[PDB]
Design a protein around this ligand. Structure first.
Ligand SMILES: [Br-]
Ligand SMILES: [Br-]
Ligand SMILES: [Br-]
Ligand SMILES: [Br-]
Ligand SMILES: [Br-]
Ligand SMILES: [Br-]
Ligand SMILES: [Br-]
Ligand SMILES: [Br-]
Ligand SMILES: [Br-]
Ligand SMILES: [Br-]
Ligand SMILES: [Br-]
Ligand SMILES: [Br-]
Ligand SMILES: [Br-]
Ligand SMILES: [Br-]
Ligand SMILES: [Br-]
Ligand SMILES: [Br-]
Ligand SMILES: [Br-]
Ligand SMILES: [Br-]
Ligand SMILES: [Br-]
Ligand SMILES: [Br-]
Ligand SMILES: [Br-]
Ligand SMILES: [Br-]
Ligand SMILES: [Br-]
Ligand SMILES: [Br-]
Ligand SMILES: [Br-]
Ligand SMILES: [Br-]
Lengths: 115, 115, 114, 115
C-alpha cells in the first residue's frame, strides 16, 4: 500500500574481495596482483576496467591479497562465480575516527602504501 | 570460485505485518480484525486462508494491530503491494530469555492472551 | 592489532518508535499523543525536549501511533525500558523517489499531515 | 515497556580470524602457523589452549592464513586487540548444500586437508 514501510536490511556499499594466488607454479609480482584485482573487479561488476578503477579505493598484496571497492550487496554477489575469489565481505574501517579503511590506498591505478 | 566465502548477511524467517484499519468506514470487532489478518496473510503469500493459518504464530488487536508469521524474506516483499499493510519487519522477541515473540499466541485460529 | 579489521554489522540512523495508548482509559487527543512522543524521545535519548524536537522528523497518531527520529542503534536500545513503548525498529522510506519516510512530517514542533 | 519489542538483528556464532605472520623473522611451517592459531584463539576467548582447541573447527595455511571457531559476536570483538590479527568476520559455507565451511577441517588438533 501507499503507507507500506518495507524493511530491506543492512545497506553495505563497500566490499572487500580477497583472492587466492597460492595455486600458481610461478608467483605473481605485486603489480601482477593489482592488475588481477582490476580485471576481477571489472569482470564481477560487468563494467570496463576503466570504470572499475573508479570503484576501487584500496588493496593489498602484503597484509592480505585482495581489493576493496564501492559496490552494492547485489553487485558483490556476482563475484561468487569468478575464479580465484576467496572472501566477499563488507569492508570495515581500520580507523573509525578518520573513516579510513585498511590496506594501501588505490586511486585510479595509483597505490599509496599505508604504514 | 571453489573456495569462495560469500557473506550474505541476515536471513529472517519470522515477520511482523501490521495493518491500517483507520481508513475503514466500519469499525472491525476483534474477531473481524483476526479474519482480516488471515485473509491478508493468504493474499500476500499466494496461498489459501487455511494454509495461511498454519504460517501465523501470533497477533494482536489491542497493543498493536498486526500479525506475525513464518515466511521467507522473499515472501515478505510480496506484502508490499497489498492494501492496508503498514510495517513489514522481522519479528523480534519480547522476552529474549524465553525466546518468545510478543502479541497473543495464535495456533490455527485459537488465540491465547499473553502477559 | 594495527591491521585488524573487525566486522560488526551495519548501523541504522533513522528509527521508528511506536507507543501503546490502548491501555488508556481516557483516550489521548492527537495533540496529547504528540506531546507524549516528544517527552518519550527526550527521555530515551537523554536530552532536553528542545533537542528531541530537533531530532524527530515524522510521527503519526492515525496510521500508527509512533514517532521517528535520527539516532543510532546504540541510542535506540535505551527506549527499551521506557513505559508505553511497543516497537523499536529502523525506519524505511515509504516513497524512495522523494526520500520520504511515512507518517506526518514533524519539523521542530510543527506537524504537517501527509 | 512490558510490551516492548526491540529490533534484534541476526547473530553469528561461527567466526573466521585471519593472521599476518610477516613481522616474525623466520617464516613459519604450517604447524607453527596452526600453533599460533591455537594460541591466538585461547588469548582472544580468555580460555585455556585446551579449551580453545575444542572451539576451533577449521583453519588454513594455504588459501588463507586463519582459523575458524565457535564464538559469539561479543567474543569475536576481543580479537581486535591481539597482535597479528587481520580480518575478524562471520564465517560462511563454501558448499551450502552440505553445510561445509572452507579451509581444512580441524578436530581438536587433527587436521584433514581439504584442497
Ligand atoms: Br586473507
Ligand atoms: Br543491493
Ligand atoms: Br547488480
Ligand atoms: Br580508505
Ligand atoms: Br584520475
Ligand atoms: Br594515504
Ligand atoms: Br577456483
Ligand atoms: Br549483518
Ligand atoms: Br477499527
Ligand atoms: Br501451501
Ligand atoms: Br504499530
Ligand atoms: Br521458512
Ligand atoms: Br492502501
Ligand atoms: Br511466540
Ligand atoms: Br500461551
Ligand atoms: Br555482527
Ligand atoms: Br526544553
Ligand atoms: Br541532540
Ligand atoms: Br508499560
Ligand atoms: Br534520508
Ligand atoms: Br520524511
Ligand atoms: Br509535506
Ligand atoms: Br539487520
Ligand atoms: Br553463524
Ligand atoms: Br592443550
Ligand atoms: Br566444516
Amino acid at each position: 500500500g501507499a503507507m507500506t514501510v518495507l524493511f530491506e536490511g543492512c545497506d553495505y556499499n563497500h566490499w572487500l574481495i580477497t583472492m587466492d594466488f597460492s595455486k600458481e607454479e610461478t608467483p605473481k609480482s605485486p603489480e601482477e596482483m593489482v592488475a588481477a584485482y582490476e580485471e576481477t573487479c571489472a569482470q564481477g561488476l560487468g563494467i570496463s576496467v576503466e570504470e572499475a578503477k573508479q570503484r576501487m579505493y584500496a588493496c593489498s598484496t602484503t597484509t592480505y591479497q585482495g581489493f576493496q571497492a564501492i559496490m552494492t550487496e547485489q553487485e558483490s554477489e556476482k563475484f561468487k562465480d569468478l575464479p580465484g575469489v576467496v572472501f566477499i565481505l563488507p569492508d570495515s574501517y581500520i580507523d573509525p575516527q578518520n573513516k579510513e579503511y585498511g590496506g594501501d590506498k588505490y586511486e585510479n591505478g595509483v597505490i599509496t602504501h599505508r604504514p
